[PDB]
């Protein structure tokens, strides 16, 4: 206490408020750039999914393991997590949703396997004893598809090897600048999602060399691309959450200054009084 301590604390908290306001600005710009990069992904996935429309669930059928709803003995999850803190509750809400559903699954006796994107989930599930089979980390704010090839490759190789029976991606969904929602959504076996080619019965392709060889790589690339889309949306959601969290923290600091300055003024006055009564009642 004493004026010269409380003024030092007020100074340090004002500095903290500078820091958090700068971080809010930075995050608010990075969110825009990240959602531009989020809308530069739709064409590839959408056209490729239209293609898989015609080739697979067309009037013509084909015998791919990744379109048939075989039996569930164990399930895989691709987990997207930030590489950086200060994100608000994002990661933990997501991990709690995941843990609740993975509990519901293991209550039928099925095992589960995790592939981790981002280091925060890596640490969390190393602590909670999850079954992490592969991971990639340090992508930061520059996610790239080439880095994702590893873990999704592992999960696919395990799926077609029979070792998995269903595959999920768990990630945040950027909806509004002010609201993002965690979602667990399936990507193997491929969902049934309209895209009817009954209209396109007018034509069929020249397949070089054959449709099955293509359909294989089509589906593999498509899964890779949906994982990438998920990573990029989660990145934009992280930026939005950091923006709102730093906003809240700047207003908290701004109120703590109001408290500290009342304490400071009280100490200022008490010190003046006690100095002056010590002088005056000294004389005589």
């Amino acid at each position: 206490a004493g004026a010269k301590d409380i003024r030092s604390k007020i100074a340090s908290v004002q500095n903290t408020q500078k820091i958090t306001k700068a971080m809010e600005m930075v995050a608010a710009s990075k969110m825009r750039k990240s959602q531009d990069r989020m809308a530069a992904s739709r064409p590839y996935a959408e056209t490729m999914r239209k293609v898989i429309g015609h080739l697979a669930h067309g009037n013509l059928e084909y015998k791919h393991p990744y379109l048939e709803d075989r039996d569930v003995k164990r399930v895989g999850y691709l987990v997207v997590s930030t590489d950086r803190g200060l994100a608000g509750g994002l990661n933990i809400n997501l991990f709690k949703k995941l843990l609740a559903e993975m509990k519901t699954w293991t209550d039928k006796g099925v095992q589960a396997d995790l592939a981790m994107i981002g280091s925060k989930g890596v640490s969390f599930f190393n602590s909670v004893g999850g079954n992490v089979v592969a991971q990639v980390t340090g992508m930061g704010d520059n996610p790239s598809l080439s880095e994702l090839i590893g873990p999704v490759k592992v999960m696919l190789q395990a799926y077609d090897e029979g070792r998995l029976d269903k595959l999920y991606i768990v990630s945040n969904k950027f909806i509004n600048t002010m609201s993002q929602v965690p979602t667990i959504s399936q990507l193997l076996p491929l969902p049934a999602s309209d895209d009817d080619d009954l209209k396109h019965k007018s034509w069929d392709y020249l397949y070089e060399p054959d449709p099955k060889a293509l359909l294989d790589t089509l589906l593999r690339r498509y899964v890779e691309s949906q994982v990438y889309q998920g990573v990029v949306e989660n990145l934009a959601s992280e930026q939005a959450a950091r923006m709102v969290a730093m906003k809240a923290a700047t207003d908290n600091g701004g109120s703590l200054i109001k408290e500290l300055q009342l304490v400071y003024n009280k100490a200022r006055q008490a010190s003046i009084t006690q100095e002056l009564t010590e002088i005056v009642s000294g004389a005589a």
């Binding site: 500078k18 820091i19 700068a22 971080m23 600005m25 930075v26 710009s29």
Partner: protein, 86 residues
């Protein structure tokens, strides 16, 4: 604070700028002349009319700078100009 209440302005000399090598370390924003341009020769009243607040803003913009690479060049022009004049 007695004397600040008696006089017609103050030139606030800032230790941080002085140690950093900005000599004379005049601190804009917090320093002020209350007679204003009435005391300033015409040419200087013309040429200097912007400097004060432009610098007052640059000094906080360049304080935002350090926590942000990848600056919008609409602001990088400003952070260059302020540094020129400083």
């Amino acid at each position: 604070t007695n004397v600040i209440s008696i006089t017609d302005g103050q030139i606030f000399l800032e230790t941080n700028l002085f140690n950093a090598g900005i000599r004379p370390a005049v601190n804009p924003g917090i320093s002020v002349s209350r007679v204003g341009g009435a005391a300033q020769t015409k040419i200087m009243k013309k040429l200097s009319g912007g400097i004060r607040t432009a610098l007052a803003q640059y000094r906080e913009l360049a304080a935002f700078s350090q926590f942000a690479s990848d600056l919008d060049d609409a602001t990088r022009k400003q952070l260059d100009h302020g540094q020129k004049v400083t």
